[PDB]
């Protein structure tokens, strides 16, 4: 991750650039919308998120976005989660819970956060990139996501909460049933955002 990247994540934050291609809404909650672009050739999706979470100190949200020990402790969908230093960077191992029948999914990736000073504004930016390691091979039963990348940008909304922007894409290793998206959309996330807020107030 360079300088380049971190600032790039901030842009759409300032301005949602969706005009480009066939984006589409999907959901709006707690002051947050989720757009998605479907790559017609691969069937893969590309998500984009904006919104405002009042009651979330831009500073907390970020801390909490890096705190595994705690995250592990409150995020109902986290089966396993841990960090290790590899060379000079921090590699994350995360195992996500999928409804049985579906295999859970697990990620190995390089994560990194930097708090930017653009215009005397503290913009907490974090980047994620899948990566690999000899000693941490794929697991049986669990589907290893080898293509995955995400960036999240946080900032004060001026009031009590925060204004944010997020990019996400990963290749899940299998077909994601539209009912799962519907759940995700209609219940999953809403509640997640909820449980999370609760999680900031109780930090």
Ligand X SMILES: CCCCC/C=C\C/C=C\CCCCCCCC(=O)OC[C@H](COP(=O)([O-])OCC[N+](C)(C)C)OC(=O)CCCCCCC/C=C\C/C=C\CCCCC
Interacting residue ranges for ligand X, rule: CB under 6 A:
26-27, 32, 34, 47, 49, 61, 77, 94, 96, 98, 107, 152, 154, 164, 166, 168, 176, 180-181, 184-185, 188-189, 192
As measured in angstroms, the least distance from the Cβ of 176 to ligand X is 5
DSSP letter (8 states) at residue 100: S
As measured in angstroms, the least distance from the Cβ of 26 to ligand X is 5
Distance (Å, whole) CA 60 – CA 188: 23
24 a known binding residue?
Answer: no
Respond yes or no on whether the N-terminal peptide bond of residue 101 is cis (omega within 30° of 0): yes
Give the DSSP letter string of 140-201: SSSEEE-EEEEEEEEEE-SSSSEEEEEEEEEE-SS---HHHHHHIIIIIHHHHHHHHHHHHH
As measured in angstroms, the least distance from the Cβ of 120 to ligand X is 22
As measured in angstroms, the least distance from the Cβ of 28 to ligand X is 9
| Residue 1: partners with Cβ closer than 8 Å, 6 or more residues away | 110, 112, 127, 129
Q: Of 9 and 166, which has the nearer Cβ to ligand X?
A: 166
65 a known binding residue?
Answer: yes
- Binding-site residues for a 1,2-diacyl-sn-glycero-3-phosphocholine, in ranges, read 65, 71, 150
- Binding-site residues, in ranges, read 65, 71, 150
């Amino acid at each position: 991750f360079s300088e380049e990247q971190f600032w790039e994540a901030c842009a759409e934050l300032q301005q949602p650039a969706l005009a480009g291609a066939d984006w589409q809404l999907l959901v709006e909650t707690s002051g947050i919308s989720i757009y998605r672009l479907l790559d017609k050739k691969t069937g893969l999706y590309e998500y984009k998120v904006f919104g405002v979470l009042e009651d979330c100190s831009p500073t907390l949200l970020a801390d909490i976005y890096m705190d595994s020990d705690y995250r592990k402790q409150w995020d109902q969908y986290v089966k396993e989660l841990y960090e290790q230093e590899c060379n000079g960077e921090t590699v994350v191992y995360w195992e996500v819970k999928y409804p049985f029948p579906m295999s859970n999914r697990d990620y190995v990736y390089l994560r990194q956060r930097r708090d930017l000073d653009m215009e005397g504004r503290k913009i907490h930016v974090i980047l994620a990139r899948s990566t690999s390691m000899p000693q941490l091979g794929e697991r049986s039963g669990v589907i290893r996501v080898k293509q995955y990348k995400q960036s999240l940008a946080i900032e004060s909304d001026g009031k009590k909460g925060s204004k944010v922007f997020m990019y996400y894409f990963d290749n899940p290793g299998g077909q994601i049933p539209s009912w799962l998206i519907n759940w995700a959309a209609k219940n999953g996330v809403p509640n997640f955002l909820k449980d999370m807020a609760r999680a900031c107030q109780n930090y």
